[PDB]
């Protein structure tokens, strides 16, 4: 039993997977088995969701997070996001679940049966962490794989049914994307936008053409980069900048994933384009705005002139100006005026909310949608009692946006922590003092006193 | 070597659970306080004292069960089982809140017992009794909050009830009625607890990250021997690190550990003094200058005046159910409320 | 050596009274800016319209505050999450009215404190130390992020970020309890276990080491003189301390291993506080404390109150009273 106790490996049971660092075969096993776990949860969770799915209830009333992902891709839904066929959901689930058996098979094999190290077995599959060439090569392979994936999204959107477009004219609907945005000024334009209010960085992408074009770009960039890293070896400045070891690479990737997790948190919290509110429920901004809309509609029906109605503070009760002058909803929701949504935009004119449009053009479907979203705001308790913290039990509801945002903030945080841990440790190990200070060569003892 | 000394011999035997003379007080009282809490939270209501369900039997969970204080009408009755209220009836005694005084009192004597245990074992092993001394802060807190505070108030009813959500309520009551967060003694308490936590964290982390390499393992716990003479981490490196990071650093280990005793113990003692004040409604509730200015000037606003509005809400909205013996009926029109909410 | 090489050597020098380092290169100016702006504002800033309803709140000493009531007041709800640097204002007077100081201070501070963490890693590396002190520091830091950045993002406005003042802090807490029932949230409860427990173990460790100090001094001198800085011998008898504590509870409840013990001392409060930070950071997206309002019901259907319902009444008081002129519609949705 090679390297399977503390005495031989140097690592205690609670750090047992650190025993895998230079055992490429077994490590391969661990990774493929884990991928199996991921695919397994995807499939199993999908089937669970589908079994619990009532098609005439909003998805977001039913604690669903995966079926919304499938539906956003255009599968299973029609106008307004109505479920017209559940079978694609079923397929996605079954196929992931079946595939996880294969992955788990390979993982268990490599982990407890196959060659424990791959280097003597295969120069192709074997690797030394310090071998910068090989590392950048494998990196290259996987970049090519990622590019291929992004291109699969593109292909779905352009040649295999399209995507669900919440902004589709005449109402949300599945639409084939035929003119993706290829202009780099726009695409990387998103990348250079402020992350702050009314800007939102890449989180602000608000049309499917930009999404698709972005994935075209990312696909080509990843394939090119992958080839590049297969064909080259790190330059000198890179060599001198980084730590070259398994734990170092792990630390780098942990940092990356922490960042991505934070980004995704914000994405699901603010964006209603790639996270359609039809499937995920309204965003926080959206529901607050919807309340303002709802009572403007009610009171105006009662005879109120909502344009001239002065609220208690002196600001408009229903309508006021943003700090740059646009007409926006009043009350606390003044904070959310950057919100944009298919149900509200028809009331928007060049200077913001249009009083004439508000007075004459509000449709019943808009009233409905505003009421729905106001009454499904992403607020709720840990035991899924919907509403403000003082609400009585009755409605079983926590928004999927809340579940996704909170989960991925937690995970992103702990992954930042993991990055600090493994980066600091990789530094110390590479320099050779990860196990402690050499008593006979204590560095501070050779330094001049501070005073 | 008469019976007293033989008994002393047996009490002080080196067994798995040490007994001692102090054990005679400690074990029955600690056992009865724990058992009373479990019995009450599992089976016993608070219908007749608070108009509350409070047991697993009634449908409460871990967060919401409690052994609740007696009715306000009981005053500060010891509420003994054989006393004039229950008159020996176990069931009525439970219904009147007997388990509350049962638990608070057996608990108090149990805490005395435990601290005596600390003295006794320290004396037997040959160490200085600083652990007992430090335990004086838990004592001060328990005695000020569970005994002195209600004794200053109308009755045992306004003591904390023994339960998770019940305690949370105690907190919110102290905010709404006492403005307890404003109290400099509570603030010192907070400084001591958060400062204690900080010292715990920073000391543990510092020791763990200035370790000498005393083994070949990458897991470094095994490279220590309780009997070893040498410091297991570098105080000199620790000192330089913190000197260059924070500007100042411990250089003396004895002072370091005494200080670790001093901060949280002192903090808790100060909080105790504050609660003793709150027993008499002797609050740090207001700043008089603030109120004079705000009364004359309707545009003058600070976070202090904001928080008082919050307190006023808490009082008006919680008092009728929280204080049922008062029979409060607050018509809707008199409830304080901001716009819309 | 060339000028840049010399400069690098100085920056990363282990001989500076205060270590600079590359993280320090960012830390020093940002912390200075945050500090200076904070002191000036706390003393002399005019009232700030925190809730964007033209109802300015006075935070500074010169404008009617003391140490306890004073604060640097969060930026206007009208700004929301918009970036509001000095050069976005038409004037310093506008800037001050709208709570510009708050944003300048918390952004410079969050950057500076992050770099403080990095700097802890860096010096640990230069001194040949193990690297994880910075990981311990990540806990208070994460908390700071939670109340100054994440909660504002989730709620859509820096006007909901924690105020830079004592009473303002209490305001933040009470409104938080109203809107999230944080006391009934298990991550806050873990946080309480973290700081109560941290205090307990701080006192416990302090007292155990102090109890077993080896006699090196007379009764007319401080026992502290019995320890000399850099001496190789441990200054207390851990076998005696363990004999004591192991007998206080039972033997296998006590640590005989100093490394294990100190690791525990680091891990308990750090993990607890990590969960406190995550509690704030997730209630930021309105996943709130347990709601057992009207959870117990009798045979007819009468509500039987529990202590949860009393908590609910208190929270209701806070909710209906807070920001009393800011809400026009019946639900407080952020």
């Amino acid at each position: 039993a090679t390297n399977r106790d503390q005495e031989s490996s140097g690592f205690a049971w609670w750090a047992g997977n650190a025993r895998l660092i230079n055992l490429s075969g077994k490590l391969l096993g661990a990774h493929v088995a884990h991928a199996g776990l991921i695919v397994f949860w995807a499939g199993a969770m999908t089937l669970f969701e589908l079994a619990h799915f009532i098609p005439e209830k909003p998805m977001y009333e039913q604690g669903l997070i995966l079926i919304p992902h499938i539906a956003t891709l255009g599968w299973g839904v029609g106008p307004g996001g109505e479920v017209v066929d559940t079978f694609p959901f079923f397929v996605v689930g079954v196929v992931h679940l079946i595939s996880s058996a294969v992955l788990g098979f390979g993982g268990v094999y490599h982990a407890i049966r196959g060659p424990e190290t791959l280097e003597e077995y295969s120069s192709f599959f074997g690797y030394d962490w310090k071998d910068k060439n090989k590392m950048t090569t494998i990196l290259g392979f996987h970049l090519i794989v990622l590019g291929i994936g992004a291109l699969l999204l593109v292909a779905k959107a352009m040649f295999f049914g399209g995507l669900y477009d919440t902004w589709a004219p005449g109402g949300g609907d599945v639409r084939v994307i035929t003119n993706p945005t290829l202009d780099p000024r726009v695409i990387f334009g998103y990348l250079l936008k402020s992350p702050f209010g009314g800007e939102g960085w890449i989180v602000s992408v608000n049309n499917l053409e930009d999404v698709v074009g972005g994935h075209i770009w990312i696909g080509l960039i990843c394939i090119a980069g992958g080839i590049w890293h297969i064909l080259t070896t790190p330059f000198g400045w890179a060599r001198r900048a980084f730590i070259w070891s398994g734990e170092a690479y792990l630390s780098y990737s942990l940092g990356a994933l922490s960042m991505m997790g934070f980004i995704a948190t914000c994405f699901v919290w603010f964006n209603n384009t790639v996270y359609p509110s039809e499937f995920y429920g309204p965003t926080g901004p959206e529901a607050s705005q919807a309340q303002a809309m709802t009572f403007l509609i009610r009171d105006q029906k009662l005879g109120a002139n909502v344009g001239s109605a002065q609220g208690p503070t002196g600001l408009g009760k229903y309508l006021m100006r943003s700090p740059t002058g646009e007409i926006i909803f009043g009350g606390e929701t003044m904070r959310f005026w950057d919100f944009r949504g298919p149900w509200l935009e028809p009331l928007r004119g060049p200077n913001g909310l249009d009083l004439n449009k508000i007075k004459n053009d509000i449709q019943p479907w808009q009233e409905r949608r505003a009421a729905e979203y106001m009454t499904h705001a992403p607020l709720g308790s840990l035991n899924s009692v919907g509403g403000v913290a003082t609400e009585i039990n009755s409605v079983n509801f926590v928004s999927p946006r809340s579940w996704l945002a909170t989960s991925h903030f937690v995970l992103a945080f702990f992954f930042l922590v993991g990055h600090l841990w493994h980066a600091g440790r990789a530094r110390a190990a590479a320099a050779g003092f990860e196990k402690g200070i050499d008593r006979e060569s204590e560095p501070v003892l050779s330094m001049p006193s501070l005073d | 070597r008469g019976w007293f000394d033989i008994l002393d011999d047996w009490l002080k035997r080196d067994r798995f659970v040490f007994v001692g003379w102090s054990g005679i007080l400690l074990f029955p009282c600690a056992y009865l306080a724990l058992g009373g809490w479990l019995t009450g939270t599992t089976f016993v209501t608070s219908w007749y004292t608070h108009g509350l369900a409070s047991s697993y039997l009634e449908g409460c969970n871990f967060l919401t069960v409690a052994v609740s204080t007696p009715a306000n009408s009981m005053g500060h009755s010891l509420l003994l089982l054989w006393g004039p209220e229950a008159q020996g009836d176990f069931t009525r005694w439970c219904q009147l809140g007997g388990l509350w005084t049962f638990i608070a009192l057996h608990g108090a004597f149990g805490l005395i017992g435990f601290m005596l245990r600390q003295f006794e074992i320290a004396r037997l092993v040959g160490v200085r009794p600083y652990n007992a001394i430090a335990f004086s802060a838990p004592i001060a807190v328990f005695v000020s909050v569970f005994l002195i505070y209600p004794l200053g108030q109308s009755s045992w009813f306004f003591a904390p009830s023994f339960g998770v959500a019940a305690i949370f309520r105690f907190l919110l009551f102290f905010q709404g009625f006492h403005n307890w967060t404003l109290n400099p003694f509570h603030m010192m308490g907070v400084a001591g607890v958060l400062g204690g936590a900080l010292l715990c964290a920073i000391h543990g982390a510092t020791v763990e990250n200035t370790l000498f390499q005393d083994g070949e393992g990458a897991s470094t716990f095994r490279a220590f021997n309780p009997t070893q003479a040498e410091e297991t981490y570098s105080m000199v490196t620790a000192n330089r690190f913190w000197s260059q990071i924070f500007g100042i650093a411990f250089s003396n280990k004895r002072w370091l550990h005494f200080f670790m005793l001093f901060v949280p113990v002192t903090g808790l003692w100060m909080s105790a003094i504050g609660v003793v004040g709150l027993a008499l409604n002797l609050r740090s509730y207001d700043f008089i200058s603030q109120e004079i200015r705000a009364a004359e000037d309707p545009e003058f606003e600070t976070f202090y005046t904001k928080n008082l509005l919050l307190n006023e809400g808490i009082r008006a909205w919680m008092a009728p159910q929280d204080q049922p013996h008062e029979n409060f009926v607050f018509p809707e029109e008199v409830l304080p409320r901001g716009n819309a909410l | 050596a060339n000028l840049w090489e010399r400069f690098c050597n100085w920056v990363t020098s282990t001989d500076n009274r205060l270590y600079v380092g590359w993280f320090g290169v960012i830390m020093i100016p940002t912390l200075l800016a945050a500090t200076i702006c904070f002191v000036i504002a706390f003393i002399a800033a005019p009232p700030v319209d925190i809730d964007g309803i033209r109802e300015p709140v006075s935070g500074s000493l010169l404008y009617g505050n003391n140490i306890i009531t004073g604060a640097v007041v969060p930026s206007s709800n009208a700004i929301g999450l918009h970036f509001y640097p000095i050069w976005e204002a038409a004037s310093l007077d506008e800037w001050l009215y709208n709570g510009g100081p708050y944003q300048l201070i918390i952004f410079h501070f969050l950057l500076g404190a992050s770099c403080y963490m990095g700097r802890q890693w860096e010096l640990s590396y230069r001194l040949g130390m193990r690297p994880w002190i910075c990981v311990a520091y990540s806990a208070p830091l994460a908390s700071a992020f939670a109340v100054f950045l994440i909660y504002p993002i989730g709620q859509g406005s820096f006007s909901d970020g924690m105020p830079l003042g004592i009473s303002g802090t209490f305001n933040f807490m009470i409104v938080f309890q109203a809107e999230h029932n944080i006391l009934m949230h298990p991550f806050h409860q873990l946080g309480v276990a973290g700081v109560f427990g941290g205090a307990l173990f701080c006192a416990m460790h302090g007292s155990l080491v102090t109890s077993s100090l080896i006699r090196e001094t007379t009764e007319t001198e401080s026992a502290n003189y019995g320890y000399k800085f850099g001496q190789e011998e441990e200054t207390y008898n851990i076998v005696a301390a363990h004999g004591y504590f192991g007998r206080l509870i039972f033997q296998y409840a006590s640590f005989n291993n100093s490394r294990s013990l100190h690791f525990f001392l680091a891990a308990w409060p750090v993990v607890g506080v990590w969960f406190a930070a995550l509690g704030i950071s997730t209630m930021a997206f309105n996943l709130n404390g347990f709601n057992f309002n009207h959870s117990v019901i009798d045979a007819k259907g009468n509500v039987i109150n529990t202590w949860a319902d009393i908590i609910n009444r208190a929270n209701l008081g806070m909710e209906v009273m807070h920001e009393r002129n800011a809400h026009n519609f019946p639900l407080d949705l952020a």
Binding site: - | - | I67, K228, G230
Partner: peptide, 30 residues
């Protein structure tokens, strides 16, 4: 006077930081 007092105590504390750091008794190894 109140403001002057608050700011004065604060200022004394900052001065104290300065002396505690740059004019501390130097730690000496035995």
């Amino acid at each position: 006077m109140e403001t002057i007092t608050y700011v004065f105590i604060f200022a004394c504390i900052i001065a104290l930081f300065f002396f505690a750091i740059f004019f501390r008794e130097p730690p000496r190894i035995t």
